[PDB]
Paper text:
Separation of cellular extracts derived from cells exposed to Api137 in a sucrose gradient reveals elevated levels of partially assembled and not fully matured precursors of the 50S subunit (pre-50S). These data suggest a second mechanism for Api137, wherein it disrupts 50S subunit assembly by inducing the formation of misfolded precursor particles potentially incapable of evolving into active ribosomes, suggesting a bactericidal mechanism.
Analysis of the Api137 dataset revealed additional structural states. These include states that correspond to the canonical route (states 10, 11, 12 and 14) plus two almost mature intermediates (states 13 and 15), mature 50S, and an intermediate with density for the assembly factor YjgA (state 9). In contrast, Api137-treated E. coli cells accumulated structurally defined pre-50S particles lacking density for the ribosomal proteins uL22, uL29, or uL16, suggesting a specific and direct effect on early and late stages of large subunit assembly.
Author numbering:
A (entry chain 2): 1 to 46
B (entry chain C): 1 to 271
Write the structure that this text describes.
Amino acid sequence: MKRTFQPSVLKRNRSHGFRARMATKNGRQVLARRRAKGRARLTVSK
Amino acid sequence: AVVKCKPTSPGRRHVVKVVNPELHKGKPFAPLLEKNSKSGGRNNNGRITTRHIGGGHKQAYRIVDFKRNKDGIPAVVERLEYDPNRSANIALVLYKDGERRYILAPKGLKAGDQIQSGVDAAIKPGNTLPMRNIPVGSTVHNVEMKPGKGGQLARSAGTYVQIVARDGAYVTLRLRSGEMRKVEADCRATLGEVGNAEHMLRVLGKAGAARWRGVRPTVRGTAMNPVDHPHGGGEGRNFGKHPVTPWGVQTKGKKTRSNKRTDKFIVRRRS
RNA sequence: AGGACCGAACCGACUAAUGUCGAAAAAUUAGCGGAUGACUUGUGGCUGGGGGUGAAAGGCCAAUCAAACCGGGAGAUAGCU
RNA sequence: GCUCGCCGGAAGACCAAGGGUUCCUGUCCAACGUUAAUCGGGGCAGGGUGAGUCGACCCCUAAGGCGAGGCCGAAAGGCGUAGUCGAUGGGAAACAGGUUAAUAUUCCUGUACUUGGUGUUACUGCGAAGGGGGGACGGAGAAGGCUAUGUUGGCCGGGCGACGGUUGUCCCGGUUUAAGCGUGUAGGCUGGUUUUCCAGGCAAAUCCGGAAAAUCAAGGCUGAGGCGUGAUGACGAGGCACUACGGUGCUGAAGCAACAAAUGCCCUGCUUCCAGGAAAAGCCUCUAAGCAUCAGGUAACAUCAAAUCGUACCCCAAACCGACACAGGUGGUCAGGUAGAGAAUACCAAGGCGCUUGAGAGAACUCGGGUGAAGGAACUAGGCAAAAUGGUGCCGUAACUUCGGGAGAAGGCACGCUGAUAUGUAGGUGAGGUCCCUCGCGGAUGGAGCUGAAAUCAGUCGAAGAUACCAGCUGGCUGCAACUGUUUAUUAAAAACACAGCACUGUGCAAACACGAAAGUGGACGUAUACGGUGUGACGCCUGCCCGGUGCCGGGAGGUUAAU
RNA sequence: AAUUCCUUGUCGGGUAAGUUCCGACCUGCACGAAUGGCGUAAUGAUGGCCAGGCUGUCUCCACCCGAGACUCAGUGAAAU
RNA sequence: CUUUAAUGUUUGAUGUUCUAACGUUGACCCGUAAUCCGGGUUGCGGACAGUGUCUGGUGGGUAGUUUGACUGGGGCGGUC
């Protein structure tokens, strides 16, 4: 059984990386909400 | 030539091949080649616009000369090649100045034949002449709608258009569809009929031929659910509805021609 | 030459048995069909919700789909328990 | 430490993705390991990752993303040019041995290679986002030359041996050596040399292409392998001396021939097929602008630099995804010996493991199997499951048929071992000698030597010789569907879906149709022998009547008919 | 008949026994000609029936080989 | 005033011709090492096509809704 999650750091970074988030304002709004909530991990990164 | 394969097995039982012995058995002219990435029916938005398109063997686009701007330059037909993009076969043409191009191959053209474009052209097949110079009552192919466009009529295999009348600056052309169209005389045209007239004889044998030719399976409306198609639904193959397109437009005998712009050039419709 | 034949890798699950608080939130054993093509697979992208895709079953869309998930209207309304 | 068992196309070794110190040592059983534990992938401390040649990095780019100007859109934003990203691809270079408890193609020893800067020497025209060649390509299939690899023989060192014999045609282990350099063959491709001209290559060109000629008929490109050097070097069985008794130092003989042979190289090769099989950069060449006492380039020499990042460990698993130390899933590479057609199957080498609860007894019952008296489907919805055949060679093979098939139809006989044919045949390979040579990796004879099926006779042991694993049950009637194929991941694989064919209809190309407030796209860089929709579904007979109701097309005589 | 209430329609084959199957008739509730009718070689992990071998499916179960079940030592849940 | 007629006037519906609006997903040149876009010339259509407001018709394609109650198995039948 191949489960839903098949890790691939390149895909992770290119789909949920900070650059991708800032590419569109919606991701910028997500980042703003994360900062307002004060999460230590703003996004997924090494 | 048309040949029928022996029924060595199902799939080969109904295969009828269209073999052209004189075609070039070698690589095409690389300088005139161009990449042709498939779209699979997708568009800029990426959604499927036209269905039943996808897959198929890779094919490289050939830059085929249509406008034929080499006026007054005699040229020789080096050889004939099969163009996957077009339904007919293309011909490599070398001009006296030392350049090679591709043209549509008429029925009467073969290797080593002489052709020439421009107004000062004869009536032999392959020559390019405006309808004003072309005598009335002749069959032509690769005709232009406007000067310099390149050519849009009679580009398939074994097709042609007949010159019927001459209304001064305009010429009447009967197309293979029975359409009587009016075209400005300044437009160019090529004499003769396109080659590979036996294109209909091919039957493709099996599913795989169409599958790798670029056509995907077609699903009938009756087999679809009501949520997707206007047809379908009901136990036991029930239709109870007039034929309609998947999008609600009534098909099977409903004219979709609403332009009112080019109708001035339309003399008669199909019948 | 074959959308050919028998048959390994590979793909799938047609039958039986076990397992249903199981080794496993559909699995294991022997049979089973394809195995040069309409085949399969690795990598990278495109098609985003009344929308996508769909050889079409109302099938799949992150173990959830006759309309996914996340937050808000919202302490929706409930003559009901 | 010695026995017994398992994998060995893996249950072995490398990696890619994915983890982040799980890797080694010292130290402890507080918590975890489905039991204990001194043990561990557990707790604490220390050490460990060395690159011009590996990869990333970097030049170019496909699908695709972003997108200066620009178009459109209430705003957000959507499309898109020039440009820039984007490896799943193309571009330059290293191999052998040794070493740590943990690194090695990185460190040490030896031999090399590639790209640029600087300087010296001798020549010379250089010079591009520009032009040309190359880069540069599909499916299927056959042969030949080879190699990795394996078998045998000779040689070397040792042994003759606890239950019979083993100085003999006997047994054990080795017989390995790279990259680079020069020769360049087997093979493949292509006709060359010279002159003149041309509106072509969006301007030019000595470059490409084309047109004329005189000459020879060869030249040129690519190209595995083998051969010498690399290498009187490393490695090498075994022996010798000390052992914190795990281990360290010295020494070190032969290192050859034949056969078979690959899915790996010649091969991006060669022959056919239609489904016609990426792009750009590096690289060679030509010139525009500008300079040609310069600058720049070429050839030889010396020197400098090649930065930065990962290098441990697991990587078919205890370390990745499955909440677990989970009978599941995970891409590529090497993958040997015997029997075997085979990467199947049976036993093994190398290498890795006995899967983290066991000790007793041998109740019913459950799970996986073995055997079975007589009947052989009488059990059951149903031959469900089980049982049975199963391979090679030879003879033979029905009805129908689209003449291909059915068919491996069905159905009949021989398979072990030894001797002879033949002190191993046919066949394959092929030494030395002899003769030529357009003289070397050259051509004939020749068979030394090695390998080596298939078949006949005779004999012989066994109840059975395809003796183990592996390995179709068979035929007839019959509905469905032409067939192959796909579907409800996770109760339905089918008569359902799809299919090649057929018929109607729409579209003249700023085409119809669909995504989009619109741009713009697919259709299509295609075009009536082209594309979309509909219904049926190979092939043969065909597809009868009906226009009243509802759609579609054409008509306008006459009545109604909004905005204005 | 993949269509049929009456129905297991009537007749012959297959078994001694056949609501299934094959062939013949049509009294077609309620087949029918491209939402196709009629045949069709080959094809099918397709539906039904029959015949040959085979056997533990069964008459009717019996023994044996391994893991559970049972006893001991250590760890130690659940539904309710 | 009922009935008519040349001239000059308001003009509308229709027909033919022209271009100066508009279209050009026709050709050439430039911004530009540019299939985008804009500009300049030309050709072809041309007051057509197309767009904006109102308006007649079609419009289960899409969106919001309804489909009463009594009713002894259900609906039917019957009543309000």
